[PDB]
Structure 1
Amino acid sequence: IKQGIREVILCKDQDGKIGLRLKSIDNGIFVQLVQANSPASLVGLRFGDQVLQINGENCAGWSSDKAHKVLKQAFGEKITMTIRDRPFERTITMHKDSTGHVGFIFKNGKITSIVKDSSAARNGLLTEHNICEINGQNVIGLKDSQIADILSTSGTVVTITIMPAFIFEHIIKRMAPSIMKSLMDHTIPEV
């Protein structure tokens, strides 16, 4: 969750696709979905990122529809965007015990209880927050089973990006949990 604003520059794939869906939230535009192996993924747009400008037009007070309209009309060659990194999220760093636990319980991606004397307790992990990333890897839409797996097979130091449920629920509204599981970039970042 960086020091604020960054410029990214995009190029539509052969199909005229950048690989992005946008949702209007509190008179901002925010990233709803980033398609695996898309232009948007390569330049490194992420779930929950904010779009301030699109080719130097201010996005504030645009509808989800209009954001999408805008993206089409644009000359494919080069699209500049001004991004604010994942404003509604935070990153917590835990360390597993020798039982391999950070020390919390979740359900449908959402944390539901914290476990006395754990690292998640020591570090102030909060309930009623949905899990967004784990060790830099988007996990939104996976089954609770798989999210578990990634925490088993991570090292000692775990890093979890979280988002207030109320805000999370209001972003993923109008996107089926098939497209979530199918098409949302869940890959480790390319270098």
Structure 2
Amino acid sequence: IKQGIREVILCKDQDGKIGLRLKSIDNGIFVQLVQANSPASLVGLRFGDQVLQINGENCAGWSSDKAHKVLKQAFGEKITMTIRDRPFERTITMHKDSTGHVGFIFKNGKITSIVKDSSAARNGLLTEHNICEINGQNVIGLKDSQIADILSTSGTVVTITIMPAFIFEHIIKRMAPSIMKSLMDHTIPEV
């Protein structure tokens, strides 16, 4: 989480798409979905990012519909956005033990217990938090088995980006679970 505001410059693809769904939260506008291989992914937009401005208009108070309409009408060539980096999220750094464990139990992406005497305990991991990302990879809507796969295959250092469940459940509301698994960008970014 870059405790910072940043400018991104987007470019609608061949099909007039940017690969983004947006959600009204507490009179702000947040990223609900970033489509794999879209302009939004290539420029590095993330789930939970806040959109402060779109072509220099402020987003405060906008409906999800108005933000989507606004994107639908931009003159294609160049869209500037002002982003605040995942403001509802925090990063926690943990170390596997000899057994390969960081030291929690999660269900449907949501941490439900912290194992006594673990790296997860020592680092103050919380329950009732959804897993958004692991070592910078978005895991939102992957099966629980595939999130364990990624944790297993990670190096002894594991970085987990988490979000309070209430806020998580508010953001993904009215997005069908298949769209999350199918189309939410789960790739490592390209350099």
1:4 CA drift (Å): 1.3
What is the rounded CA distance, in whole Å, between the counterparts of 2:70 and 2:84 in structure 1? Answer: 19
Q: CA deviation at 1:162?
A: 0.1
Q: For residues 4 and 52 of structure 1, what CA distance do their matches in structure 2 show?
A: 12
Deviation at 1:135, TM superposition (A): 0.4
* Rounded Cα–Cα distance in structure 2 between residues aligned with 1:146 and 1:28: 32
Aligned length: 191
Distance 2:171 2:67 in 1: 15
CA–CA distance in 2 between the matches of 1:64 and 1:154? 36
Secondary structure (helix, strand or coil) at the match of 1:178 reads helix
Deviations 1:63-106 (A, max 9, x none): 00000000011100000000000000000000000000000000
Shift, 1:189, TM fit: 1.0
TM-score with structure 1 length normalisation? 1.00
**Gap regions ≥5 residues in structure 2:** none
Once the two structures are superposed, the pairs formed by residues 64-83 of structure 1 within 5 Å of their partners are 64-83=64-83
Correspondences of 1:2-41 after superposition (within 5 Å): 2-41=2-41
| Superposition deviation, residue 133 in structure 1 | 0.1
Provide Cα deviations, 1:7-51, integer angstroms capped at 9, x if missing partner: 000000000000000000000000000000000000000000000
Q: d(CA) in 2 for partners of 1:60 and 1:8?
A: 18
Deviation at 1:3, TM superposition (A): 2.6
Q: Give, in whole Å, the separation in 2 of the partners of 1:116 and 1:3.
A: 31
Runs (4 or more) in structure 1 with deviation over 4 Å come to none
Distance in 2 separating the partners of 1:61 and 1:38: 27
Work out the percentage of aligned pairs sharing the same amino acid: 100
Aligned counterparts of 1:19 and 1:190: Cα–Cα separation in 2: 17
In 2, the alpha carbon distance for the partners of 1:73 and 1:183 equals 23
How far apart, CA to CA, are the structure 1 residues paired with 2:11 and 2:126?
Answer: 39
Aligned to 1:102: 102
Where does residue 126 of structure 2 map in the other structure?
A: 126
1:143 Cα deviation from its structure 2 partner: 0.4
In structure 1, C-alpha distance between the alignment counterparts of 2:11 and 2:70, rounded to whole Å: 15
Distance 2:71 2:189 in 1: 24
Give the distance between the partners of 1:179 and 1:79, measured in 2 at CA: 25
Q: SS at 1:185's partner residue?
A: coil
Matched, 1:53 2:71: no
- Cα shift at 1:140: 0.2
* Alpha-carbon distance in structure 2 between the residues aligned to 1:60 and 1:190: 32
Which residue does the alignment assign to 2:91?
91
2:73 and 2:35 mapped to 1: Cα distance? 20
2:23 is paired with a residue of what secondary structure?
Answer: strand
1:152-186 Cα distance to aligned partner (Å, 9 max, x none) = 00000000000000000000001011010000000
